[PDB]
Amino acid sequence: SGFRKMAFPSGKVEGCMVQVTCGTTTLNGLWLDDVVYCPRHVICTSEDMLNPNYEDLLIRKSNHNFLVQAGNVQLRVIGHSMQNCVLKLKVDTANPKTPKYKFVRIQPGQTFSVLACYNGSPSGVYQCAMRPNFTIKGSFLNGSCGSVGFNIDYDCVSFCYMHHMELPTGVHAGTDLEGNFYGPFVDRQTAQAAGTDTTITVNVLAWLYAAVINGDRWFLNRFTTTLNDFNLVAMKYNYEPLTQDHVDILGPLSAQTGIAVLDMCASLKELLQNGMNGRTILGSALLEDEFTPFDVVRQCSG
């Protein structure tokens, strides 16, 4: 029993983290086979960061301008290219610790593990959700750019995030591993703003199911609701609309607990309209929205 925010074991990713240096700029890279992936703004100086033309900046670089360190071993760069906002450095050595892997671009509401790194060295692991406004609420200091986010599925690592920048509000923005930003953001040092965020409804429902699986039932009621009438209440409280596909995804949890999805929606509706009145759910006084239905099944199996 118990329910905890749980990251994937990070070892398969730790063996891929390296340090990339160009001039005075140092950040983290991901070494898979004989290619190192890192944020392309590693080629920028501080003055370049205002409004860089990256094609221009990269054409002025040669292979020996890039320093790649794996542990205390220096890797020789033998080619370089740019794919969207990621720099790819071909090195002369294949990473012997390369796991089975894929690159995946996730949807808002999905979660992943972040391996926070500094100078190519991992410092900690935590769970994040991609917010509906395509930011994540991470923990990142200077030097963390290039840290990656990932899921693991039967010894296959699915990389889904590379960290690029902190926005003025303190939330974080980044790309998939093919260099495409999540959201409308661009990689230049100007004040960009995230859109207004909303709560991930299907995830809150998953977490309420986790609470029932763990014996917490106080928030249930005898009522049900229609999908349409639930969504009218969702809008008012800044919750994302629940779709029929969300209902279908929650099927397994609904079957395990005996609580129909729209019955749990009636519980959430009442929780939104009256609050918790001092009680907690799985140790929380706020409704939690960073557990997917998959996260719940993975941790609550049985």
Ligand X SMILES: CNC(=O)C[C@H](Cc1ccccc1)NC(=O)[C@@H](Cc1ccc(Cl)cc1Cl)NC(=O)[C@H](N)Cc1ccccc1C#N
Catalytic positions, please?
41, 145
What are the residue ranges of helices labelled H in 180-225?
201-213
Minimum distance from residue 86 beta carbon to a copy of itself (Å): 23
Element (H, E) at 218: none
Nearest to 120 by CA among 33, 26, 37: 26
| Cα 144 from Cα 118, distance rounded (Å) | 5
Which residues contact residue 34 at a Cβ distance below 8 angstroms, ignoring those fewer than 6 apart?
90, 91, 92, 93, 94, 95
Nearer to a copy of itself, 24 or 301 (CB): 301
Three-class secondary structure of residue 13 per DSSP: helix
Rounded distance, CA 164 to CA 259, Å? 42
* Nearest distance in Å: CB 171, a copy of itself: 8
Among residues 83, 126, 193, 223, the one that binds a copy of itself under rule CB under 8 A? 126
Least distance from ligand X to the Cβ atom of residue 76, Å: 26
Widest CA span in the chain: 69
Tokens of 11: 């070892």
We find the least distance from the C-beta atom of residue 244 to ligand X, in angstroms, to be 35
302 binds a copy of itself (CB under 8 A): yes
Token representation of residue 285: 């006084």
Does 72 engage in binding with ligand X (CB under 6 A)? no
With binding defined as CB under 8 A, does residue 96 bind a copy of itself?
Answer: no
* One residue of 41, 164, 172, 246 binding a copy of itself per CB under 8 A: 172
| Residue 241 structure tokens | 């609309």
Whether 39 contacts 189, CB under 8 Å: no
Sequence-separated (6 or more) residues with CB below 8 Å from residue 4 = 299
Query: Any contact of residue 191 with a copy of itself (CB under 8 A)?
Result: no
The footprint of ligand X on residues 162-181 (CB under 6 A) is: 164-166, 168, 170, 172
Of 51, 62, 72, 142, the one binding ligand X (CB under 6 A) is 142
Q: How far apart are CA 11 and CA 21, in angstroms?
A: 24
Q: Counting contacts by CB under 6 A, is residue 140 touching ligand X?
A: yes
Strand, coil or helix: 230: helix
For ligand X, the closer of residues 213 and 296 by Cβ is: 213
Residues 239-298 that bind ligand X (CB under 6 A): none
Piece in contact with a copy of itself (CB under 8 A), picked from 40-48, 163-171, 188-196, 252-260: 163-171
Closest CA to 186 of 22, 44, 51: 51
Which residue's CB is nearer to a copy of itself, number 79 or number 124? 124
Which range of residues in 96-104, 188-196, 251-259, 275-283 is near ligand X by CB under 6 A?
A: 188-196
Q: Which residues bind ligand X (CB under 6 A)?
A: 1, 41, 49, 140-142, 144-145, 164-166, 168, 170, 172, 187-189, 191
Q: Which residues bind a copy of itself (CB under 8 A)?
A: 1-12, 14-15, 115-116, 122-126, 137-142, 166, 170-172, 214-215, 280, 283-286, 298-299, 301-302
